[PDB]
Amino acid sequence: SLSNKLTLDKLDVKGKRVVMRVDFNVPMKNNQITNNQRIKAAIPSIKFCLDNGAKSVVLMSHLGRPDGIPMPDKYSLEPVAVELKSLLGKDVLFLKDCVGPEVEKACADPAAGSVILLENLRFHVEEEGKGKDASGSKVKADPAKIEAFRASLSKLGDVYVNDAFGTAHRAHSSMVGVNLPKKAGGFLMKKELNYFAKALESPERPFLAILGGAKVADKIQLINNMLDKVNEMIIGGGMAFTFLKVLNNMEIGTSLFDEEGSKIVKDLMSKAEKNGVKITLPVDFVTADKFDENAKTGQATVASGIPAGWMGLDCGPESSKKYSEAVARAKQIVWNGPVGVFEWEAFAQGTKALMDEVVKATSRGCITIIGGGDTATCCAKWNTEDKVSHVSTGGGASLELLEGKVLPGVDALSNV
Numbered sequence: 001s002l003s004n005k006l007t008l009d010k011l012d013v014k015g016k017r018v019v020m021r022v023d024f025n026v027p028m029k030n031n032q033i034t035n036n037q038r039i040k041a042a043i044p045s046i047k048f049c050l051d052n053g054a055k056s057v058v059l060m061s062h063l064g065r066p067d068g069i070p071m072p073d074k075y076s077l078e079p080v081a082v083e084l085k086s087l088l089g090k091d092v093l094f095l096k097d098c099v100g101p102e103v104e105k106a107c108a109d110p111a112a113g114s115v116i117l118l119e120n121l122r123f124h125v126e127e128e129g130k131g132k133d134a135s136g137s138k139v140k141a142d143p144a145k146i147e148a149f150r151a152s153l154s155k156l157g158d159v160y161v162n163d164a165f166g167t168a169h170r171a172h173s174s175m176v177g178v179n180l181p182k183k184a185g186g187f188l189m190k191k192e193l194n195y196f197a198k199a200l201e202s203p204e205r206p207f208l209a210i211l212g213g214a215k216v217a218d219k220i221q222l223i224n225n226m227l228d229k230v231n232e233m234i235i236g237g238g239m240a241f242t243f244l245k246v247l248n249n250m251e252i253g254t255s256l257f258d259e260e261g262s263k264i265v266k267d268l269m270s271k272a273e274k275n276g277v278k279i280t281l282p283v284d285f286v287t288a289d290k291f292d293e294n295a296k297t298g299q300a301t302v303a304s305g306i307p308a309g310w311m312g313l314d315c316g317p318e319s320s321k322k323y324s325e326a327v328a329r330a331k332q333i334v335w336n337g338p339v340g341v342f343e344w345e346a347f348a349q350g351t352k353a354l355m356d357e358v359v360k361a362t363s364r365g366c367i368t369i370i371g372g373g374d375t376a377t378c379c380a381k382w383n384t385e386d387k388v389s390h391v392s393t394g395g396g397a398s399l400e401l402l403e404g405k406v407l408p409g410v411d412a413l414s415n416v
């Protein structure tokens with residue numbers, strides 16, 4: 001049960017040193033942060049600790065993909081420290097490393113109310129347990145060193161708090177190796193577990209899942225698992241052309257086709273019928289003569305087929321109507337993946353219209369949950385982050401949750 005894990009509000013931090021794992025993997029264009037959304041997201045957890053008398057808050061996170069070797073020139077968290085200070089209003093001590101006697105000493109007895117940010121955990125191959133040398137050759141971490149790394153991290157605080165849901169699907173040292181008597185989820189993690197608990201433990205009904213994306217094969221377990229809990233499912237995006245070709249014998253031109261996935265489609269539909277799940281597929285499409293932002297546009301339906309040399313990049317007006325009718329009946333919605341190439345405005349209208357409908361549903365009480373990744377980015381583009389119930393901060397992690405797997409980082413949390 002994701003609802004029985006220990007969270008920050010139920011943890012006494014008065015006079016305690018708090019070692020907190022956060023998600024500060026922010027976007028950078030070299031010498032500056034373009035989006036500080038992730039940083040602003042951690043603030044509530046940090047302020048809570050400081051406001052509740054914590055002795056200190058030690059922040060650890062990763063940035064980019066260093067792959068096990070120090071790359072301060074490219075992926076140092078120093079810029080984040082400066083950005084965090086402006087947002088928190090308090091000084092932030094940035095340390096050039098995350099482990100060692102020097103670091104342990106700075107954290108052994110800091111000035112009350114201190115906020116410390118350690119350097120990129122991934123500068124050490126012991127965090128991921130694997131990496132690469134300067135030559136690009138694969139290097140596997142040494143067990144004894146992994147032990148020493150985790151023992152060091154464990155010395156930086158008295159209680160452990162995990163607010164990095166985006167990395168919880170990884171058995172990395174900072175996720176499962178900090179040995180402290182209290183391991184609690186932070187406020188962001190609390191939200192992730194509370195909403196996905198609904199999507200998998202006790203959802204409101206009807207429960208509709210909107211599944212988009214391009215590939216089918218890598219989404220087989222997700223669909224399989226969702227078919228065990230939903231009442232209705234919209235299958236859109238590039239994904240639908242595999243379904244439409246197999247079941248309807250539709251001519252799809254040069255639209256995405258998943259040979260692997262195509263062999264399991266009838267079986268998925270079969271399970272859908274056995275469970276009484278209503279499947280809604282697109283009936284019309286916006287086509288393009290090439291996969292490009294400026295391609296020529298056309299229109300097509302399932303009956304007309306798609307011209308040779310053309311591909312479906314978005315659903316048409318008739319599909320949007322059907323999609324909106326499904327949203328209308330639901331009391332709960334989980335949406336993972338865009339219904340078209342939302343990166344390009346000409347093919348983002350299908351996705352935008354659905355977002356509008358989902359926001360409207362939210363206003364009347366619908367529990368709307370948006371998965372991480374692209375779809376999550378959609379909410380940032382049209383500024384609807386505050387118009388839905390929950391926007392997941394973990395792309396790959398939210399996917400593994402929806403698949404029915406146990407997240408190592410969630411599993412390691414203390415139980416209430």
Ligand SMILES: Nc1ncnc2c1ncn2[C@@H]1O[C@H](COP(=O)(O)OP(=O)(O)OP(=O)(O)O)[C@@H](O)[C@H]1O
Pocket residue numbers: 212213214215236237238239256312313314335336337338339340341342343371372373374375376395
């Ligand atoms: N009809 C289509 N043809 C080709 N590509 C498409 C189509 N519809 C959507 N896409 C592309 O699918 C990509 C997303 O697919 P992918 O399987 O990678 O992720 P996803 O399941 O949508 O996850 P997320 O929730 O992160 O969006 C987007 O970049 C989008 O441009």
